[PDB]
Design a protein around this nucleic acid. Structure first.
Ligand code: MG
Ligand code: ZN
Lengths: 143, 55, 8, 170, 1113, 93, 165, 168
DNA sequence: GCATCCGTGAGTCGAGGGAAGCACAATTTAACACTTTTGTCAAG
DNA sequence: CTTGACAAAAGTGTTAAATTGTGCTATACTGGGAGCCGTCACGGATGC
């Protein structure tokens, strides 16, 4: 981009690279039911590892993994977004067998169902804000 | 209530039969002359419901 | 792979 | 595909403000029809909504008071101008419609670069947010005069352009 | 308005007939005028002699001759009645009984062959159509290098498309050459054994190269007899099938030796002989004679491959994109192939019919079923990609379309599977394919235009003309020659100086195999006819092409096709010389057959009394609607008693002025920024153009309605429409159709129709309503035809076709059809697209009053203002030079012809500007006026910018500006001059077919889709705007969650939401919270149909019913 | 730009909270027919009509103008939703 | 005309590649949203100010446009003391701060700047406000609830048509 | 072989009609009209019956047939759904009910119920005079007098206000 | 290691495009009349 | 207001034509046919 004169902040590229490095590969199952060589999200194994330490068990040993944007997108936890992207037959056949439950976390899943996307005015941070004047509030405070 | 999760799973023959309102036994779609759906066909009104509301 | 050939 | 949506050729409006667009009267009448029928019913133009809709059916049956009511209908409201391909988020922007005579959308010169829009035959789509939430989002977040910097780089995106630079440089 | 011609190149030959590619090929295919005995084995005649005779193996059906009858209806009748302009085809066949020895002969009707009109188009189902010529790889034998392994080559034998499998000859790494057929690889030894080849023959022929021959000398099958080798090969080709000789020889003979199934083609046979140096008896890989196979081309192909691998000097690889290896399938060849395909199906039915059913009492009429033949021909002219709706916006549009060459179509490349190699400009495109004219975008390079002087030969190879040069003098002998033949000579350039017939330049610019070289005159063997042969007809219409970048010259030539005819269209001030020929060769205009005197002139017909004594009446096509809606009319240009010579103009066609191609107006153009209304290609025009009806065009729209038979009852086209006042039915006549000459606006009824209402009990509210008002509900409803929004005009024609009318084949159940023609005279308005020939295009953004436009010191305002910023980035300097020349012509009252690459130059333009200044300024001196104070101030600034020489008088400095094309321009608003001189001149601008009137569209509610319940799409359907994925991403990036949700549910497919939203708005309320879209409901049901249990759950994993209990048992 | 948009953005921690407050206030004004406005008669937005100046019918314009005054209290968990509606019904029938 | 056709063919076949790339980038990052003010992570990235030039075998200062694209609108993870100016931890780097850092680097006072980036963010299903930095459209700290993943994908994918030239 | 099944006897007729048309087509050197086909079929056949038979023999066209060289347009994209009420049609029905309810408000507390029962505004189905009488406990003539009285005052109220003529 | 199989390739628009016959039984449907509800006119 | 008269429309019942479904035909007949390369290129995933 620089060689072409395009100016782009490094944040946008680092957001995508963060998604590429989102997964890890298990090398030692430890005191868990995970399989050696199984690929899962880095957040899950770290959360599982800190959990295993809590009850005094051998933590899961993992290895950082890098995959492309297509592979990272297709191996997402939500089957609705993955099915709408590509390999619809392959995504749906695995999700149906695994009985995968889509929690509707991202934007594509909510768009498919026509729901309010969890971003912007639809985010839980601002969605529940209330507005009231100093007279409709003062009267309520009395009660 | 409100939809929070969507789940996909294999459908058993018992579930497929529970979904169905009737077995489609004939390939006939509609009558060629009267243009009404044929009984037990792919467009059967006893299976999939009335063509027009409350009739 | 050919159903007609397989039948024949 | 969406309701309350139109499309027409774009021409340059140099007299417009950064937050304004030139919406043809005929497009606005169809885009804001349910709002216009309510306004026509409120005034003496039509007895009810159904009689109001019959009036707009025939071009020669439309009186001159309908256009005055249409001006009242769109007051404060904004519309969304969209040019394909919408490569970035500035491909859709909110403008306050200004009723004009003609059939071409008048585009402000400063938003051309964000839209990647010139006037050699380009077209854009017009969309009408309906609710107070949809209007508030467009008037606060999507307004053209509020998005002056590029989200990609942080540099100004609505900035002086070909003829504007030439005049100031001279 | 005298015409001044520039240039030095003397063209020895004129332009060939511009439609000969379409017209000559179809004549050679039908052969309808040559007597049957003198017909040659080409076209549909060759198709008859290929499939016939038909033998049962003892009934023989032989073919004797064919003939084409007169068309049942004329061309005008076919267009009016939605018919096909076609000629009946009759075949004279004889049935031969081998047993008895008796012959029965009769003429059988084989169907109708569509006829090509004089202009080179077809009338299919009443619509003019053009068959686009297809370019593809020429059949033959080609030797391409293997990319994976260096030093090795692959021999490919390509037959005609769908006329045999491709054959690959490759030297395997093991050393054994393997022949790949039908995706199957097998050693070439086996098939070579089948062709009666022994070890001695192979070593004697192929043994002079090295170890390659020893790799083809496997004796495990050499001792094996040829008959067993055929059985062994047959099992390899189709494993599993029962291997029998009668089933093996038939397959092998059909594969490479059957002319009816394998056809190398005349082009393929010629290319094979030219390459391999052999003489093919036929067009098959092998000949099957005397009960044994004989080799034709495998050994010559194998010898060449081995020698090429060895490294002999005389053998080389073949460039597949070389235009000597690419041929053109014209309309005649494309139809003949479809004729042969259908005729093969006819033979198939004939074979299966002569073996069953009264074999003793059989006749050729009973055996022959013409339905397969008509179906194949009808399919080609209707549903083929190469059969395209005729583009007849103007005469140039139709001419361009017939000369287009497309690499796509059945048997060609794919729009998305085509790489850069097929899309590039090969060096052999010079003089044969235009390098600039092509549709930018996904179709770039895949659709091209034939060059002006290029012509397609019999074999399908494009040829270009060259002037033979002997001993350094250029002769008048012109040789038409293909790319492969062109590569053997040193061909000079047409701009080479000539001292008469001898080349004067000591160093001559020439081409050797496409590479530019410098050679002496004695080394020159051929010369170009003219620069015009390198470019197509459209590009040859762009003056000063040498100053235009190819990227913009592409746009200029393409946009000339999209220019609409104008009621006051004028030929350009600066021309190239092809304007007369384009009109003449398009057949749009009317010319005298020979010398004669005009007898009667009228707006409807011209009667000419030719010297032969015959009175020939010429009807004039008046206000005829083109396929694109543009009105095509011929206006007489002669008077009663005028003497006309042969070829003299009688009536101007559409978009022509006195026989010259008139695609636009010549307007005074000032090149300057103007208050931001010129911003980013936008155009500023004067109101004076509208006052004198410039850029005013007539367009006709056709509306169609049908009265059909319904189970409830027949639809009636009548004036008695229920629940309508007289105001709505004022313009309808007694028959229910709008009267001719009535002005119709949107919502106005064109044809009144009433249809029976479906039997259904009314809603209880309606029943109370009817009972209150005492009105009996009628049995019919309003289904009349009304003017769509944004349309209208004057009704000019009403066509009423009824069932049983002569030649009217209405669809079953259709009582009648009524067609209404509404014509509107469109003036230039804001948003209409304008363009010039040099690629500069833009929409009108502002129409100013005459007093607001900048004006000359003499008071002449300019007509168009163009932004100078569109020049530097686009590098199209031709518009600048046309403006300078047009400025001289404006004051001298003359037009110019500057041929491309040989025409007007700056010294010649400046000397004309010097003459123009003397009449532009010397007039002012005579009138008694000096130099303006405002002019002096501009001249003071001009000398500061270096535009004029300091120290000269104001008159002398004004001349210097004029010689640069710049004048002192005053401002109509302020009265003060523009601070710098402005390039002002006369330029030819076209009004393109894309108008804002036909593109503006809006919608609140309307039709919705069947399954998804989403709004339809398209202005014609009153559809909504597609809010695709990228638009959804933009709302997500903005954070407009509620705006996005509305466009997903409330405005698209939330049936309960969209009904409530509309009801809330008309009641003055806020729209409600939306619900689940219907598209997701469809997704759930479609997923269930795949046996996938999709369930929507809540916070506690309990299922949530989104179907409202309508699907739960 | 919208009047006082810079001041509006500086009054909330997230620009999307500003839109929620404006849209929710606009609906409150529409529901009660602009009778719950905190704007004095000199401050009510006005539109120029052929007959004369009238109250601006755009509630979003009212909500933005009211919020600049500072007489509106906005936030999360201010009052119960049912309690807020019933109280506003009683004051502004 | 040979080059003009190749350029025209390149443009036609690059729009499909650029458009496909943008769709891939959207679908991998569509769920990334600024979901909290701070995730509490102490990790960071040290954005370099000097580039390892190899032709001269020496460290040379990076281009100003390059340093701005990596430091503008970013929260400092650690305190920086350059040219007598104390940039405290948690301070968003404005253009003046970025220019000040480059000025300090030219004086040999700092080699890299430790800033919070989405790479080291610990927020699940998105980023935090302090790891993203500024809303480049508003030149102020990003508001919680913005779909930065969609913005990032569009920002990268929009100039794709211009890349190959 | 047909998506819309046709009986054997009618299929045999279609085949015979096609053979007759084909034989006449080669004899006349053109496509025969329905008159020539009907005559060649024999007794009991006229142009109307031949035309109806051809109309019956029309196979349904696929909703997924592409149009244009680009593979992005289909037949189903151009066929509107005319079954579900449009938003305009749904809105005017609710507007009509609101206006009708206001008109019935001016009626007496007894007349309105009789009129709505007779017009099926409550149960969805009309009730005959005796059933309306069995509902209230009066003979049929009482309802026919009440209905004619309730329906007449509505004419007066509508004529004196003209708030209900537009919906008609 | 390499062969081999599978899925992927911008957006909006636009317009044009739209070869068996018979017998026989079995079922369905138009055609008809008679009686029964419903609706209506009178009366007191 | 209800009684009764009074009749038009609507509702059962028979029933003939019209339509639809099903069986049968006896020299002998015993393994298909359209496709057919500018094979699209390239990355990934599986496999043996
Ligand atoms: Mg453009
Ligand atoms: Zn963080």
């Amino acid at each position: 981009y620089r060689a072409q004169g395009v100016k782009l902040h490094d944040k946008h590229i680092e957001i995508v690279v963060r998604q590429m490095m989102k997964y890890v590969e298990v090398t030692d199952p430890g005191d868990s039911r995970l399989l050696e060589g199984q690929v899962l999200e880095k957040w899950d194994v770290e959360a599982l590892n800190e959990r295993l330490i809590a009850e005094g068990k051998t933590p899961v040993a993992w290895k950082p993994l890098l995959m492309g944007v297509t592979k990272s997108a297709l191996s997402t936890k939500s089957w609705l977004s993955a099915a709408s992207f590509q390999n619809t037959t392959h995504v749906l056949t695995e999700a149906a067998i695994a009985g995968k439950k889509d929690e509707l976390i991202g934007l594509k899943e909510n768009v498919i169902l026509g729901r309010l996307i969890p971003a912007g005015t639809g985010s839980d941070f601002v969605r529940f804000t209330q507005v009231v004047d100093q007279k409709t509030l003062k009267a309520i405070e009395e009660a | 209530k409100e939809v929070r999760k969507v789940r996909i799973a294999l459908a058993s023959p018992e579930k497929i039969r529970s979904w169905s309102y009737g077995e489609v036994e004939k390939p006939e779609t509609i009558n060629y002359r009267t243009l009404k759906p044929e009984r037990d066909g792919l467009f059967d009104e006893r299976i999939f419901g009335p063509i027009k509301d409350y009739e | 792979s050919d159903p007609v050939r397989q039948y024949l | 595909r969406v309701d309350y949506s139109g499309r027409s050729v774009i021409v340059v409006g140099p007299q417009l403000k950064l937050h304004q667009c030139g919406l043809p009267k005929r497009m606005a009448l169809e885009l804001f029809k349910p709002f216009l029928l309510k306004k026509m019913e409120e005034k003496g133009i039509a007895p009810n909504v159904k009689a109001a809709r019959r009036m707009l059916e025939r071009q020669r049956d439309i009186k001159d008071e309908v256009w005055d009511a249409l001006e009242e209908v769109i007051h404060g409201k904004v519309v969304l101008l969209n040019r394909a391909p919408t490569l970035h988020r500035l491909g859709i922007q909110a403008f306050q419609p200004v009723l004009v005579e003609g059939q071409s959308i008048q585009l402000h010169p400063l938003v051309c670069e964000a839209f990647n829009a010139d006037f050699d035959g380009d077209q854009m789509a017009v969309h009408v947010p309906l609710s107070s939430f949809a209007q508030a989002e467009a008037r606060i977040q999507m307004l053209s005069a509020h998005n002056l910097l590029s989200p990609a780089s942080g540099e100004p995106l609505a900035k002086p352009s070909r003829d504007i630079i030439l005049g100031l440089y001279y | 308005m005298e015409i001044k011609r520039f240039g030095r190149i003397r063209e020895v030959i004129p332009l060939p007939p511009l439609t000969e590619i379409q017209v000559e090929s179809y004549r050679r295919a039908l052969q309808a005028d040559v007597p049957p005995e003198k017909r040659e084995n080409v076209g549909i005649q060759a198709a008859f002699r290929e499939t016939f005779p038909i033998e049962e193996e003892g009934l023989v059906l032989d073919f004797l001759e064919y003939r084409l009858g007169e068309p049942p209806f004329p061309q005008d009748e076919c267009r009016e009645k939605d018919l096909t302009y076609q000629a009946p085809l009759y075949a004279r066949l004889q049935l031969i009984h081998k047993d008895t020895g008796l012959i029965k002969e009769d003429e059988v009707f084989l169907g109708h062959i569509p006829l090509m009109t004089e202009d080179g188009s077809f009338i299919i189902n009443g619509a003019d159509r053009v068959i686009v010529s297809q370019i593809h790889r020429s059949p033959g034998v080609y030797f391409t290098p293997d990319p994976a392994r260096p030093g090795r080559y692959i021999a490919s034998i390509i037959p005609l498309p769908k006329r045999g499998p491709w054959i690959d000859l490759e030297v395997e790494p093991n050393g054994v050459v393997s022949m790949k057929v039908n995706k199957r690889k097998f050693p070439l030894v086996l098939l070579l054994r089948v062709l009666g080849y022994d070890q001695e023959t192979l070593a004697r022929e192929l043994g002079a190269y090295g170890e390659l021959v020893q790799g083809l000398m496997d004796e495990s099958v050499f001792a094996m007899r040829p008959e067993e080798a055929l059985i062994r090969l047959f099992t390899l080709l189709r494993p599993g099938d029962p291997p029998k000789r009668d089933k093996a020889v038939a397959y092998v003979y059909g594969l490479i030796a059957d002319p009816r199934r394998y056809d190398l083609g005349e082009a393929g046979r010629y290319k094979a002989e030219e390459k391999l140096g052999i003489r093919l008896s036929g067009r098959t890989l092998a000949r099957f004679e005397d009960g044994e196979f004989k080799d034709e081309v495998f050994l010559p192909t194998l010898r060449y491959l081995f020698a090429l691998t060895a490294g002999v000097p005389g053998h080389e690889v073949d460039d597949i994109d070389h235009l000597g290896n690419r041929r053109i399938r014209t309309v005649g060849e494309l139809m003949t192939d479809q004729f042969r395909v259908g005729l093969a199906r006819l033979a198939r039915g004939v074979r299966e019919r002569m073996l069953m059913g009264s074999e003793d009492s059989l006749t050729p009429a009973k055996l022959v079923n013409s339905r397969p033949l008509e179906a194949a021909i009808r399919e080609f002219f209707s549903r083929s990609q190469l059969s395209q709706f005729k583009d007849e916006t103007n005469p140039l549009s139709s001419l361009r379309h017939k000369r287009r060459i497309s690499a796509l179509g059945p048997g060609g490349l794919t729009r998305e599977r085509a790489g850069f190699d097929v899309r590039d400009v090969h060096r052999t495109h010079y003089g044969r394919i235009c390098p600039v004219e092509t549709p930018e975008g996904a179709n770039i390079g895949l659709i091209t235009s034939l060059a002006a002087y290029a012509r397609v030969d019999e074999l399908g190879f494009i040829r270009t003309p060259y002037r033979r040069v002997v001993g350094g003098v250029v002769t008048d002998e012109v040789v038409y020659m293909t790319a492969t033949e062109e590569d053997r000579y040193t061909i000079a350039q047409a701009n080479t100086p000539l001292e008469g017939n001898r080349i004067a330049a000591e160093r001559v610019v020439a081409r050797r195999k496409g590479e530019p070289v410098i050679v002496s005159p004695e080394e020159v063997e051929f010369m170009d006819v003219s620069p015009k042969q390198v470019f197509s007809v459209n590009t040859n219409l762009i003056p000063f092409l040498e100053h235009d970048d190819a990227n913009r010259a592409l746009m200029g030539s393409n946009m000339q096709t999209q220019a609409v005819p104008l009621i006051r269209a004028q030929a350009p001030v600066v021309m190239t010389g092809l304007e007369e020929r384009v009109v003449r060769d398009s057949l749009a205009a009317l010319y005298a057959e020979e010398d004669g005197e005009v007898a009667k002139v009228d707006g409807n017909r011209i009667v000419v009394r030719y010297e032969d004594g015959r009175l020939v009446e010429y009807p004039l096509r008046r206000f005829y609607r083109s396929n694109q809606g543009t009105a095509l009319d011929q206006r007489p240009r002669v008077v009663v008693g005028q003497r006309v010579r042969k070829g003299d103009l009688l009536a101007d066609g559409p978009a022509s002025e006195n026989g010259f191609l008139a695609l636009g107006q010549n307007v005074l153009v000032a090149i300057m920024p103007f208050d931001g209304y010129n911003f980013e290609d936008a155009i500023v025009i004067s109101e004076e153009l509208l006052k004198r009806d410039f850029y005013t065009s007539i367009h006709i729209e056709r509306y169609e309605i049908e009265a059909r038979d319904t189970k409830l009852g027949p639809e009636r086209i009548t004036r008695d429409i229920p629940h309508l006042s007289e105001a709505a039915l004022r313009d309808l006549d007694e028959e229910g159709v709008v009267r001719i000459g009535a002005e119709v606006k949107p919502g106005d009824i064109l044809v009144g129709r009433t249809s029976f209402k479906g039997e259904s009990e009314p809603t209880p509210e309606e029943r109370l309503l009817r009972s209150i008002f005492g009105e009996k509900a009628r049995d019919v409803k309003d289904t009349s035809l009304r003017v769509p929004p944004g349309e209208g005009g004057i009704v000019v024609r009403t066509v009423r076709l009824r069932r049983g009318d002569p030649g009217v084949e209405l669809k079953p159940g259709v009582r009648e059809v009524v067609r209404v023609y509404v014509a509107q005279k469109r003036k230039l308005q804001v948003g209409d697209k304008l363009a010039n020939r040099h690629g500069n295009k833009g929409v009108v953004a502002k129409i100013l009053p005459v007093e607001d436009m900048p004006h000359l010191p003499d008071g002449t305002p300019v007509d168009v203002i163009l932004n100078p910023l569109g020049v530097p980035s686009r590098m199209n300097l031709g518009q600048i030079l046309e403006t300078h020349l047009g400025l001289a012509g404006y004051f001298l009252g003359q037009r110019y012809i500057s041929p491309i690459f040989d025409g007007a130059k700056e010294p010649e333009i400046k000397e004309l500007l010097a003459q123009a200044f003397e009449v532009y300024f010397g007039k002012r001196k005579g009138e008694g006026f000096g130099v303006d104070k405002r002019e002096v101030e501009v001249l003071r600034r001009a000398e500061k910018l270096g535009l004029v020489t300091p120290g000269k008088t104001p008159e002398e400095q004004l001349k210097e500006l004029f010689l640069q094309g710049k004048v002192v321009l005053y401002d109509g608003r302020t009265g003060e001059p523009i601070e710098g001189p402005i390039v002002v001149g006369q330029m030819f601008i076209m009004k393109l077919y894309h108008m804002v009137e036909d593109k503006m569209h809006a919608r609140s509610t309307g039709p919705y889709s069947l399954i998804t319940q989403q709004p339809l799409g398209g202005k014609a359907q009153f559809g909504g705007q597609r809010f695709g994925e990228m638009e959804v991403w933009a709302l997500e990036a903005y954070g407009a969650a509620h705006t996005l949700q509305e466009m997903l549910t409330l405005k698209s497919d939330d049936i309960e939401g969209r009904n409530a939203a509309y009801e809330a708005i008309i009641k003055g309320e806020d729209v409600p919270e939306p619900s689940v879209p219907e598209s997701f409901r469809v997704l759930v049901k479609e997923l269930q149909a795949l046996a996938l249990d999709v369930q929507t759950l809540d916070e506690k994993d309990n299922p949530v019913d989104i179907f409202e209990g309508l699907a739960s048992k | 730009a919208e009047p006082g948009i810079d001041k509006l953005f500086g009054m909330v921690d997230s620009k999307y909270r500003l839109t929620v407050v404006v849209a929710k206030r606009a609906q409150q004004l529409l529901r009660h027919g602009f009778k719950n406005t905190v704007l004095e008669p000199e401050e009510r937005p006005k539109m120029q009509t052929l007959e004369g100046l009238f109250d601006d019918p755009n509630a979003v314009t009212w909500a933005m103008k009211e919020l600049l005054t500072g007489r509106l209290v906005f936030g999360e968990n201010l009052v119960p939703e049912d309690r807020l509606q019933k109280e506003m019904e009683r004051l502004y029938p | 005309s040979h080059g003009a056709r190749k350029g025209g063919a390149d443009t036609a076949l690059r729009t499909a590649d650029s458009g496909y790339l943008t769709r891939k980038l959207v679908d991998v990052t569509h769920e990334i949203v600024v979901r909290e003010a701070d995730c509490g992570t102490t990790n960071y990235i040290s954005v370099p100010l000097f580039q390892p030039d190899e032709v001269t075998r020496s460290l040379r200062l990076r281009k100003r446009a390059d340093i701005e694209a990596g430091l503008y609108g970013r929260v400092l993870a650690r305190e920086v003391e350059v040219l007598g100016v104390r940039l405290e931890e948690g301070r968003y780097l404005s253009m003046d701060d970025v220019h000040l850092l480059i000025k300090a680097a030219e004086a040999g006072e700092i080699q890299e700047v430790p800033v919070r980036s989405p790479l080291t963010c610990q927020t699940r299903y998105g980023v935090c406000q302090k790891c993203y930095g500024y809303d480049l459209s508003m030149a102020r700290p990003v508001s919680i609830g913005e779909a930065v993943g969609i913005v990032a994908a569009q920002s990268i994918g929009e100039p794709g048509t211009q890349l190959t030239m | 072989a047909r998506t819309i099944r046709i009986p054997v006897h009618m299929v045999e007729t279609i085949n015979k009609l096609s053979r007759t048309a084909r034989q006449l087509q080669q004899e006349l050197g053109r496509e025969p009209t329905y008159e020539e086909i009907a005559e060649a079929m024999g007794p009991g056949w006229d142009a109307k019956r031949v035309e109806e038979t051809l109309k019956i023999a029309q196979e349904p066209v696929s909703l997924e047939t592409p149009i244009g060289d680009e593979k992005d347009s289909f037949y189903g994209d151009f066929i509107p759904d005319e079954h579900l009420p449009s938003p305009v049609d749904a809105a005017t029905q609710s507007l009509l009910s609101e206006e009708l309810e206001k008109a019935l408000s001016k009626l007496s507390e007894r007349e309105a119920m009789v009129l709505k029962l007779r017009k099926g505004l409550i149960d969805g189905r009309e009730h005959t005079l005796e059933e309306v009488g069995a509902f209230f406990g009066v003979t049929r003539e009482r309802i026919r007098q009440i209905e004619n009285k309730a329906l007449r005052k509505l004419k007066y109220h509508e004529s004196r206000t003209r708030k209900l003529r537009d919906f008609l």
